[PDB]
Curated annotation (Swiss-Prot), chains B, G:
Whole-protein residues included: 74 to 341 of 2209
Source organism of the structure: Poliovirus type 1 (strain Mahoney)
Superkingdom to which the source organism belongs: Viruses
Protein localization: Virion; Host cytoplasm
Subunit structure as annotated in this protein's UniProt entry: Interacts with capsid protein VP1 and capsid protein VP3 in the mature capsid.
Effect of H191 to G/T: Complete loss of VP0 cleavage
Record-given protein name: Capsid protein VP2
Classification of source organism: Viruses, Riboviria, Orthornavirae, Pisuviricota, Pisoniviricetes
Protein role: Forms an icosahedral capsid of pseudo T=3 symmetry with capsid proteins VP1 and VP3. The capsid is 300 Angstroms in diameter, composed of 60 copies of each capsid protein and enclosing the viral positive strand RNA genome.
UniProtKB/Swiss-Prot annotation, chain C:
Quaternary data: Interacts with capsid protein VP0, and capsid protein VP3 to form heterotrimeric protomers. Five protomers subsequently associate to form pentamers which serve as building blocks for the capsid. Interacts with capsid protein VP2, capsid protein VP3 and capsid protein VP4 following cleavage of capsid protein VP0. Interacts with human PVR.
Protein name, UniProt field: Capsid protein VP1
Stretch list, region Disordered: 1-21
Task of the protein: Forms an icosahedral capsid of pseudo T=3 symmetry with capsid proteins VP2 and VP3. The capsid is 300 Angstroms in diameter, composed of 60 copies of each capsid protein and enclosing the viral positive strand RNA genome. Capsid protein VP1 mainly forms the vertices of the capsid. Capsid protein VP1 interacts with host cell receptor PVR to provide virion attachment to target host epithelial cells.
Location in the cell: Virion; Host cytoplasm
């Protein structure tokens, strides 16, 4: 899906 | 106020000095910013600053000039106009860096039978135009920096044609604000008008303004004070009236960094 | 919370007046402008105002690419006596006048810079020879880095300087640059010198230009035709467009009223009369 | 990472929106949002120390 | 498979972010993240066996 | 190397430091295409001796 | 300390200046009193004081003198020795009143083969005797106040017999501490000894001492520094050894009252 | 994911 850093 | 207080009657006290006035037109705080010390979040030189407080943040009176029907206007630069003023000047020349705000109080009284109006403008970075049409940007440090005597405006541009030994001074034309822009627009700069029927002074509180938190006071002037007759001096039916104009200026919240031996500039 | 595209204030209906309230009377000596609106001096109706100031926000006022320079380069025959022309430009907005005047409504500014490059070429000699499609190298040389002396010397290697290799006839080249100033804002005006003249030093030694700070403020763009020499000479021009994105400005100034005369605020004799004749009582 | 904002719709044919995704690490590469703020002109139009009441005498 | 990271915003006009999607199987094809770590210089600046206390004599 | 900072030998003020070493990271120091060679080729007339 | 710390190895930092030493004999705080600013309960002039802090409270190095087998001794007065030192001197001459404490660091190194001992004495109100036997109390301001060069002691009293144009200077006899009392007793004053085999410096921290909270720095010296060879310089078998002596002094907690125009004294 | 202004 989406990773967030 | 019902207890007598007025917009026209003020008292300013800084250090061991007090100014009174009974005919003010309120007072101006440039861009709504009161002078402040440099904040830690905006700080840059890391050494402990010198902050002379009452020793330098006090009212210094410069040499009085004279307004006549032929006056085209006067100009001063800050901090340059104050470079020889007591411990402010000393603290300035002993340090690489310095920043300061100012209270500028222009004084000019006359009588109910005189008339005339002085525009008093505080300009940030007041770059003035040179006298040459052979070389641009050639005004010398010595001529750019008159100290307390200031300089004057002229109604006529007159080019320095001596190419062997050029004058290297400014040629500030009044309707062009000495910088190539129209004087009628100078009102976008923080200002007051001394209109003799209304008031006998102008008071401008100036914050330190710069693209840096602190800088070389000796190399760079932050503010310029320009005084121009918007309506000429006139009295009764005298052909040659004169009234004096006196500038008193106080540094405010000034701090200095980079202490070393004293700077001894070439001023002539 | 008020945004640039919000509608301006409504006009409120106001009726007749007879009081000690005097909005019309003021005193400009104070340094203030009288904050009046029509309902202060005339009778008004209620109007629901829809107009906004969206297009005059600082960003929108500047949101356009302006031409700041034209660089000339060529690629001659190998047999020429004259060297292959590569161009060297000191980056600035002061070689042209239009963007300069707009930026100079203000004393200081911060912005990210968008540079767009339009490249055109032509034949010069009344020949009949052709040239294959040219590739151009636009090298940014920051103050300190070695400036090219020849179209083909070692500096065009660019191991660390940023370079754009542009192919002729493709979309105009474009890059962005952050706020790169060494100060907290760009100074459009610097009332000062870069040197203090000391008494104990000669006049020459203490001298410097009025209003100039870092001699090489932002460095250089150097442009070349990468193609080797060709029998038929082609000349090209690189037009540079600057747009200030994400901009902030401080301390408003009266706009330039007489023609620019150099990078400083100087003016030339003969250009000092902008205003025209018009009679005081003539509409 | 998509940003969805509304358009101020001028000529008409709900809220119409548009989408923005940043493709680069450096904010300098970003387009301009044009989502800007306004402020009061007072620091330039009323720089006086004592607040001006327009119905009152400017000088008292 | 989208990676959403924040930008360090330098000049200003919340957190502004940007999006990254890898298009290839080989990590060699990937762009550089620039999301890098720092370390202490000690292995080069203080390679001594006995820990240095800077207020103390370096030699005792 | 002596790990000193200005407050060790002079009087200092409090400064909130904003600068970073982002552009001198190993990656950022090398994050540029450098020219390593120029190869020459041609396509002549079929009639050439070379 | 087990982490290496020593009585002999010190670092002193004031303003932008640091002194190090690896051969000290501890350091002295005169009468156990560290310098302090004037307290409100003891205050006297009511105007806001100037307190220049790092701009003046920093180490100033005076001109280096030379110790030889014929040296009888040297003396300096405070604040006089510092009257021309950067912004301390400026702040001093611009104000009627001023008070200050000091860190005095006397420097003199030699070698394990040299010998000699300097008594370094800080004397409150160090009144010195004049050269005349026709007039008492006649040493002129100019001769009483040498500035940074200081003065010297003599082993012989020699009266000024020119009555037409009298010298009007001190004639400070060393075994009489220049004031009519025996030098062997000078140890009741705050002191250290620079004995070359043991140490290469003396450090005296001096509080402001006076019968007043604040006074005229220009008219009155609070402390005197007297350096005398208690055991003469000697080296190997050389007949004419020389080693230098350097004074570095820092004002501490100095504050000034009564700001006006600068004092311009007759010093010659 | 998505921010919404
Ligand atoms: C491959 C192309 C790279 C191009 C890189 C350009 C970097 C230099 C940016 C120059 C910024 C110029 C800003 C404008 C001028 C300043 O406002 C004023 N003269 C005051 O500092
Ligand atoms: C946030 O962005 C999560 C949703 C991703 C939407 C599709 C992204 C479209 C392609 C962006 C490619 C990466 C840009 C380098
Ligand atoms: C994770 O990536 C799930 C979300 C997908 C977002 C849209 C992808 C955009 C197009 C990528 C194409 C494939 C690359 C080979």
């Amino acid at each position: 899906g989406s990773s967030s850093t | 106020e019902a207890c007598g207080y007025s917009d026209r009657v003020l008292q300013l006290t800084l250090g061991n000095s007090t100014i009174t006035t009974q005919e003010a037109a309120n007072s101006v705080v440039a861009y709504g910013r009161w002078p402040e010390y440099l904040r830690d979040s905006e700080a840059n030189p890391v050494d402990q600053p010198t902050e002379p407080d009452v020793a330098a943040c006090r009212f210094y009176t410069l040499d009085t000039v004279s307004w006549t029907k032929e006056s085209r206007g006067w100009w001063w630069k800050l901090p340059d106009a104050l470079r020889d003023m007591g411990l402010f000047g000393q603290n300035m020349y002993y340090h690489y860096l310095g920043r300061s705000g100012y209270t500028v109080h222009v004084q000019c009284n006359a009588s109910k039978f005189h008339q005339g109006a002085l525009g008093v403008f505080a300009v940030p970075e007041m770059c003035l135009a040179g006298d040459s049409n052979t070389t641009t940007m050639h005004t010398s440090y010595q001529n750019a920096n008159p100290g307390e005597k200031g300089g004057t405006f002229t109604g006529t541009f007159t080019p320095d044609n001596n190419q062997t030994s050029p004058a290297r001074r400014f040629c500030p034309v009044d309707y062009l604000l000495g910088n190539g822009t129209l004087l009628g627009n100078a009102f976008v700069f923080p200002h007051q008008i001394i209109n003799l029927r209304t008031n006998n002074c102008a008071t401008l509180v100036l914050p330190y303004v710069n693209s840096l938190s602190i800088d070389s006071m000796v190399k760079h002037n932050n503010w310029g004070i320009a005084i121009l007759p918007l309506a000429p001096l006139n009295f009764a039916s005298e052909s040659s009236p004169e009234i004096p104009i006196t500038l008193t200026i106080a540094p405010m919240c000034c701090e200095f960094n980079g202490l070393r031996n004293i700077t001894l500039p070439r001023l002539q | 919370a008020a945004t640039s595209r919000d509608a301006l204030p409504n006009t409120e209906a106001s009726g007749p007046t007879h009081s000690k309230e005097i909005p019309a009377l003021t005193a400009v000596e104070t340094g203030a402008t009288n904050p009046l609106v029509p309902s202060d001096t005339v009778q008004t109706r209620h109007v629901v105002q829809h107009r906004s100031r969206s297009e005059s926000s600082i960003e929108s006022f500047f949101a356009r690419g302006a031409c700041v320079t034209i660089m000339t380069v060529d690629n001659p025959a190998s047999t020429t006596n004259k060297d292959k022309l590569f161009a060297v430009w000191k980056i600035t907005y002061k070689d042209t006048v239009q963007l300069r005047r707009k930026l100079e409504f203000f004393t200081y500014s911060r912005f990210d810079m968008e540079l767009t490059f339009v490249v055109t070429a032509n034949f010069t000699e009344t020949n009949n020879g052709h040239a294959l499609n040219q590739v151009y190298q636009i090298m940014y040389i920051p103050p300190g880095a070695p400036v090219p002396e020849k179209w083909d010397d070692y500096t065009w290697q660019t191991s660390s300087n940023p370079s754009i290799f542009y192919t002729y006839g493709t979309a105009p080249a474009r890059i962005s640059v952050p706020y790169v100033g060494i100060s907290n804002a760009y100074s459009h005006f610097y009332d000062g010198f870069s040197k203090v003249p000391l008494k104990d030093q000669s006049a020459a030694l203490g001298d410097s230009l009025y209003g100039a700070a870092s001699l090489n403020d932002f460095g250089i763009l150097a442009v070349r035709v990468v193609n080797d020499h060709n029998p038929t000479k082609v000349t090209s021009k690189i037009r540079v467009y600057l747009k200030p994105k994400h901009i902030r400005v401080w301390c408003p100034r009266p706009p330039r009223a007489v023609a620019y005369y150099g990078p400083g605020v100087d003016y030339k004799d003969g250009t000092l009369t902008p205003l025209s004749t018009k009679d005081l009582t003539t509409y | 990472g998509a940003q969805v904002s509304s358009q101020k719709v001028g000529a008409h044919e709900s809220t119409i929106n548009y989408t923005t995704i940043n493709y680069y690490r450096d904010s300098a590469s970003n387009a301009a949002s044009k989502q800007d703020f306004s402020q009061d002109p007072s620091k330039f139009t009323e720089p006086i120390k004592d607040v001006l009441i327009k119905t009152a005498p400017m000088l008292n």
